[PDB]
Amino acid sequence: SFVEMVDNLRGKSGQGYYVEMTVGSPPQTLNILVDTGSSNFAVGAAPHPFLHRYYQRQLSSTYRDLRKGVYVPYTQGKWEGELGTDLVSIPHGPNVTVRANIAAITESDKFFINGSNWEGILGLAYAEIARPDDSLEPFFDSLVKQTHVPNLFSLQLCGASVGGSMIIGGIDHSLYTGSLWYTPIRREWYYEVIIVRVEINGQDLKMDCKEYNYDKSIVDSGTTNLRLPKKVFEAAVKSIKAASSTEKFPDGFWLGEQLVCWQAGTTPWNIFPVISLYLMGEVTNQSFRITILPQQYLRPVEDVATSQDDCYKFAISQSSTGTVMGAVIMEGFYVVFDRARKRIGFAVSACHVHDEFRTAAVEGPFVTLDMEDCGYN
Numbered sequence: 001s002f003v004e005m006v007d008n009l010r011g012k013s014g015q016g017y018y019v020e021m022t023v024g025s026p027p028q029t030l031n032i033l034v035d036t037g038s039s040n041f042a043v044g045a046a047p048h049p050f051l052h053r054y055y056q057r058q059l060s061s062t063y064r065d066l067r068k069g070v071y072v073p074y075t076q077g078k079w080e081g082e083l084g085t086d087l088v089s090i091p092h093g094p095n096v097t098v099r100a101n102i103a104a105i106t107e108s109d110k111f112f113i114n115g116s117n118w119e120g121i122l123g124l125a126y127a128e129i130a131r132p133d134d135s136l137e138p139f140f141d142s143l144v145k146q147t148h149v150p151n152l153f154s155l156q157l158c159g160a161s162v163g164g165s166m167i168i169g170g171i172d173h174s175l176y177t178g179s180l181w182y183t184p185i186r187r188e189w190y191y192e193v194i195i196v197r198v199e200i201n202g203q204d205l206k207m208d209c210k211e212y213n214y215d216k217s218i219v220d221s222g223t224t225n226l227r228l229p230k231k232v233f234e235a236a237v238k239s240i241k242a243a244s245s246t247e248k249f250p251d252g253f254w255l256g257e258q259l260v261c262w263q264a265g266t267t268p269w270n271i272f273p274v275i276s277l278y279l280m281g282e283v284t285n286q287s288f289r290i291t292i293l294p295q296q297y298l299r300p301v302e303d304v305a306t307s308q309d310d311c312y313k314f315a316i317s318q319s320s321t322g323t324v325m326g327a328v329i330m331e332g333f334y335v336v337f338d339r340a341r342k343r344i345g346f347a348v349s350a351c352h353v354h355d356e357f358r359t360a361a362v363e364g365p366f367v368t369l370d371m372e373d374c375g376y377n
């Protein structure tokens with residue numbers, strides 16, 4: 001019965017993916033951003049320039065105030081509001097209704113995006129990182145406890161304006177090709193995993209694998225880019241520059257500031273290398289890899305003028321909070337958040353990218369010794 005959830009996600013490039021939900025009685029329709037990088041379910045509950053609509057607690061008869069404030073600071077943007085509970089459902093999802101915690105956003109800063117089409121956020125990560133504290137039961141946890149929906153979900157994020165699917169309670173075998181490869185969830189807070197090796201164009205970066213996960217590595221559908229720790233980022237950029245030394249790009253480009261352009265349909269994809277991230281496997285000394293094509297870390301953006309040339313932005317940025325595998329990584333892959341078995345699965349998506357002589361992939365099995373030492377402590 002997962003077919004009903006296929007294609008239940010929409011959104012704009014770089015503005016996140018959202019699914020339709022309803023809260024309160026009678027049901028109030030809202031587009032909620034799907035974010036595996038947080039654990040708070042929050043929605044606008046007051047007027048805002050970027051909000052076409054919002055949650056009105058007054059009109060909901062099933063609303064319950066918790067008389068307790070709350071705020072959440074993201075890497076970029078933040079909001080604060082009032083806690084409470086109410087009935088929630090997902091039209092294009094499982095046919096159920098659960099009472100979940102809801103943070104009514106009353107004030108925010110750089111959180112809502114102008115014209116994103118969503119008015120809330122659904123944090124699918126664990127309680128450990130929920131605000132104010134890990135006692136605020138996350139939405140998915142409530143769903144699993146109050147219904148018979150299996151403890152897992154999968155995400156198929158498709159690029160291009162953008163669409164995808166969020167299969168709640170299972171895996172839809174029609175959304176991916178090949179085999180699914182699983183990596184352990186190291187700890188249940190963020191969806192933390194362990195990168196044991198990195199290669200660019202088949203060339204190993206040869207860095208202490210601890211650097212790849214300093215201070216952690218997470219799968220964040222709520223982040224657009226692939227964010228890398230300072231040292232790793234520098235090495236990656238240096239390698240990518242050399243691979244594309246044929247052409248010249250402004251230094252601001254490698255910082256995600258300036259967008260490079262090329263004649264409509266003349267993008268030199270070949271000069272850009274593929275990036276391979278090896279992840280910890282499910283058995284001793286075993287790992288697997290996911291390969292990313294340039295069409296993934298070169299997010300396309302509208303021409304800065306009236307020109308009709310292909311312009312893109314470097315979707316790989318530096319991080320100070322660990323590696324972040326955002327949409328640019330997830331796009332083209334079918335990702336299974338198998339909470340019940342503490343693992344995350346990856347498979348080539350049915351809506352993957354298309355390069356002439358190259359292809360995004362998930363390959364295994366590989367042998368990698370001392371993977372344990374790759375985790376940071």
Ligand SMILES: O=S1(=O)C[C@@H](Cc2ccc(O)c(Br)c2)[C@H](O)[C@@H](NCc2cccc(C3CC3)c2)C1
Nearest residue numbers: 015016037038073074075076077111129222223
């Ligand atoms: O770039 S982010 O801030 C986008 C954010 C979700 C978000 C928020 C506002 C937006 O317009 C968009 Br688009 C997306 C994620 O949720 C973050 N996930 C990691 C994280 C980083 C710092 C603090 C937290 C606290 C747990 C929530 C989580 C990464």
